[PDB]
Scaffold this active site. Structure first.
Site, PDB file in Angstrom:
ATOM      1  N   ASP A   8       0.931  -1.377  -0.084  1.00 16.81           N
ATOM      2  CA  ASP A   8      -0.023  -0.043   0.223  1.00 16.81           C
ATOM      3  C   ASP A   8       0.798   1.389  -0.094  1.00 16.81           C
ATOM      4  O   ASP A   8       1.447   1.603   0.957  1.00 16.81           O
ATOM      5  CB  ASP A   8      -0.726  -0.016   1.283  1.00 16.81           C
ATOM      6  CG  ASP A   8      -1.560   1.221   1.487  1.00 16.81           C
ATOM      7  OD1 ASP A   8      -1.759   2.266   0.471  1.00 16.81           O
ATOM      8  OD2 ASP A   8      -2.270   1.097   2.945  1.00 16.81           O
ATOM      9  N   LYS A  69       1.998  11.417  -3.561  1.00 13.55           N
ATOM     10  CA  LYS A  69       0.761  10.848  -3.979  1.00 13.55           C
ATOM     11  C   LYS A  69      -0.099  11.976  -5.067  1.00 13.55           C
ATOM     12  O   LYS A  69      -0.702  11.596  -5.843  1.00 13.55           O
ATOM     13  CB  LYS A  69       0.085   9.859  -3.328  1.00 13.55           C
ATOM     14  CG  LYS A  69      -0.907   9.034  -3.907  1.00 13.55           C
ATOM     15  CD  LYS A  69      -1.053   7.753  -3.166  1.00 13.55           C
ATOM     16  CE  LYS A  69      -2.375   6.944  -3.511  1.00 13.55           C
ATOM     17  NZ  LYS A  69      -2.836   5.830  -2.433  1.00 13.55           N
ATOM     18  N   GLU A 173      -7.303  -0.046  -4.440  1.00 16.56           N
ATOM     19  CA  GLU A 173      -7.568   0.002  -2.991  1.00 16.56           C
ATOM     20  C   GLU A 173      -8.499  -0.704  -2.541  1.00 16.56           C
ATOM     21  O   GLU A 173      -8.554  -1.773  -1.467  1.00 16.56           O
ATOM     22  CB  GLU A 173      -7.044   1.202  -2.278  1.00 16.56           C
ATOM     23  CG  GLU A 173      -5.595   1.639  -2.492  1.00 16.56           C
ATOM     24  CD  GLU A 173      -5.299   3.261  -2.069  1.00 16.56           C
ATOM     25  OE1 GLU A 173      -5.980   3.727  -1.870  1.00 16.56           O
ATOM     26  OE2 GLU A 173      -4.145   3.608  -2.721  1.00 16.56           O
ATOM     27  N   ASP A 197     -13.420   3.953   3.529  1.00 20.53           N
ATOM     28  CA  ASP A 197     -11.769   4.251   3.563  1.00 20.53           C
ATOM     29  C   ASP A 197     -11.664   5.541   4.276  1.00 20.53           C
ATOM     30  O   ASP A 197     -11.674   6.354   3.240  1.00 20.53           O
ATOM     31  CB  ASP A 197     -11.246   3.747   2.340  1.00 20.53           C
ATOM     32  CG  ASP A 197      -9.488   3.918   2.377  1.00 20.53           C
ATOM     33  OD1 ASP A 197      -9.077   4.433   3.291  1.00 20.53           O
ATOM     34  OD2 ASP A 197      -8.938   3.202   1.632  1.00 20.53           O
TER      35      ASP A 197
HETATM   36  N1  ADP Z   1      -5.635   4.119  16.399  1.00 23.70           N
HETATM   37  C1  ADP Z   1      -5.747   5.207  15.750  1.00 23.70           C
HETATM   38  N2  ADP Z   1      -6.770   6.031  16.053  1.00 23.70           N
HETATM   39  C2  ADP Z   1      -7.333   7.146  15.007  1.00 23.70           C
HETATM   40  N3  ADP Z   1      -6.389   7.292  14.053  1.00 23.70           N
HETATM   41  C3  ADP Z   1      -5.374   6.570  13.631  1.00 23.70           C
HETATM   42  C4  ADP Z   1      -5.141   5.431  14.334  1.00 23.70           C
HETATM   43  N4  ADP Z   1      -4.169   4.962  13.787  1.00 23.70           N
HETATM   44  C5  ADP Z   1      -3.663   5.779  12.696  1.00 23.70           C
HETATM   45  N5  ADP Z   1      -4.610   6.612  12.476  1.00 23.70           N
HETATM   46  C6  ADP Z   1      -4.581   7.459  11.670  1.00 23.70           C
HETATM   47  O1  ADP Z   1      -4.720   6.886  10.231  1.00 23.70           O
HETATM   48  C7  ADP Z   1      -4.365   7.735   9.411  1.00 23.70           C
HETATM   49  C8  ADP Z   1      -3.311   7.061   8.552  1.00 23.70           C
HETATM   50  O2  ADP Z   1      -4.202   5.950   7.706  1.00 23.70           O
HETATM   51  P1  ADP Z   1      -3.624   4.962   6.710  1.00 23.70           P
HETATM   52  O3  ADP Z   1      -4.790   4.294   6.104  1.00 23.70           O
HETATM   53  O4  ADP Z   1      -2.606   4.247   7.671  1.00 23.70           O
HETATM   54  O5  ADP Z   1      -2.568   5.821   5.622  1.00 23.70           O
HETATM   55  P2  ADP Z   1      -3.507   6.387   4.343  1.00 23.70           P
HETATM   56  O6  ADP Z   1      -4.633   6.934   4.485  1.00 23.70           O
HETATM   57  O7  ADP Z   1      -2.237   7.160   3.774  1.00 23.70           O
HETATM   58  O8  ADP Z   1      -3.520   5.106   3.425  1.00 23.70           O
HETATM   59  C9  ADP Z   1      -3.444   8.876   9.951  1.00 23.70           C
HETATM   60  O9  ADP Z   1      -4.209  10.215  10.240  1.00 23.70           O
HETATM   61  C10 ADP Z   1      -3.323   8.591  11.579  1.00 23.70           C
HETATM   62  O10 ADP Z   1      -3.093   9.259  12.569  1.00 23.70           O
HETATM   63 MG    MG Z   2      -4.959   4.386   2.142  1.00 22.45          MG
END
Ligand code: ADP
Ligand code: MG
Length: 381
Positions: A8, A69, A173, A197
């Protein structure tokens, strides 16, 4: 004995998994994290990637790159590129109509294409996998958003090639997240799947139909500028107003202080997903004054309530575009790190009249997990 990996390559956090010996393993990074910020820092002596890049952004803002991105496969002149540029601390320039980021690296002025920055993240994920497996990794499935066009898809494949990966396939995704839960392997009969998502930077609602293993994206909705970093910003505003009241100073013109605060906010936000209270602790935040306080879950929920609530309009629009009622969705799947927020889950579940959500796979890892399965399928006979 060669294993391929699923990656990812996310807007804010990237993730790598491998399908091995029964099970999918999501690989921990240099700091023990299962997701890796899509950040690259150019310093006097080093090129840092991931967590160490993110943590030194406060001190080296102009040479710390992220959000590649958002540039990939676009032109400099695009209106979304010019808008996003106003919010980044790193320089973007035009070369032949294409965006490049401009930084200082080893005291030298360098420019890089968005696919070169993304290749550095993919190289980290590749090496992360190699350290774990103790062998070369040469093949990968890499995911992209459902709305990515051909030129965005090719540019992501090129990032993979530049990182030394043979890209087996570029997959969507939401399709990867459905594959992660085996939703394409539940025998005969069409199923309709809603992927919700909510990431660090973007919010994507996808309606999929699956039949005999064939995926069709029926609809997509969302907002490319809604995600966890907006919840972090709400917390930043709350705490700078608290700093004002407690310590008598406005820190809204000190970029470094706002960045240090933002980091402590993101940590507090994550803690509030599994506790009802979280501390915020920063030494020497502004003019040598330490800032030590706390916040309740309930207060975080108030601070972001409009944002959380807004995520339901796209769900409704997507269903409308798919020409489906919510009772006709067989599976709802939680994807994105922000769907770990308990209030976001409650809001989605109440919207679906109490339907159970697919969330047993960590939502921030589900895309990499499905990509890992898919990579194994394509390596097979
Ligand atoms: N336990 C959690 N509770 C709330 N937010 C979270 C938690 N773990 C990760 N995040 C948040 O998720 C986001 C990252 O999302 P992710 O799906 O890992 O990446 P992307 O969106 O780039 O694919 C960030 O804003 C991060 O702070
Ligand atoms: Mg993502």
């Amino acid at each position: 004995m060669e294993l391929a990996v699923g990656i990812d390559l996310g807007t804010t956090y990237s993730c790598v998994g491998v399908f091995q010996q029964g099970r999918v393993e999501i690989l921990a990074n240099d700091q023990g994290n299962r997701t890796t910020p899509s950040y690259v820092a150019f310093t006097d002596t080093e090129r840092l990637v991931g967590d160490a890049a993110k943590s030194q952004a406060a001190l080296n803002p102009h040479n710390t790159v992220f959000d590649a991105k958002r540039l990939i496969g676009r032109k400099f002149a695009d209106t979304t590129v010019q808008s996003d540029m106003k919010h980044w601390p790193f320089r973007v320039v035009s070369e032949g109509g294409k965006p490049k980021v401009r930084v200082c690296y080893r005291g030298e002025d360098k420019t890089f294409y968005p696919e070169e920055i993304s290749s550095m993240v993919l190289s980290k994920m590749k090496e992360t996998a190699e350290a774990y497996l103790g062998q070369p990794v040469k093949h990968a499935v890499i995911t992209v958003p459902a709305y990515f066009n051909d030129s965005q898809r090719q540019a992501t494949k090129d990032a993979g090639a530049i990182a030394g990966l043979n890209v087996l396939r570029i997959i969507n995704e939401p399709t990867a997240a459905a594959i992660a839960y085996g939703l394409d392997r539940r025998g005969a009969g069409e199923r309709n799947v809603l992927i919700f998502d909510l990431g660090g930077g973007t919010f994507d609602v996808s309606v999929l139909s699956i039949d005999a293993g064939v995926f069709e994206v029926k609809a997509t909705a969302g907002d490319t500028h809604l995600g966890g970093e907006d919840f972090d910003n709400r917390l930043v505003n709350h705490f700078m107003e608290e700093f004002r009241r407690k310590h008598g100073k406005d820190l809204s013109g000190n970029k470094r202080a706002l960045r240090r605060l933002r980091t402590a906010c993101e940590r507090a936000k994550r803690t509030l997903s599994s506790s009802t209270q979280a501390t915020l602790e920063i030494d020497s935040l502004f003019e040598g004054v330490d800032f030590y306080t706390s916040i309740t879950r309930a207060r975080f929920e108030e601070l972001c309530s409009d944002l959380f609530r807004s995520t339901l309009e796209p769900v409704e629009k997507a269903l409308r575009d798919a020409k489906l009622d919510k009772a006709q969705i067989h599976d709802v799947v939680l994807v994105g790190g922000s769907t770990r927020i308990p209030k976001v889950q409650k809001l989605l579940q109440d919207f679906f009249n109490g339907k159970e959500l697919n969330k047993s796979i960590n939502p921030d890892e589900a895309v990499a997990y499905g990509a890992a399965v898919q990579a194994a399928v394509l390596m097979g006979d």
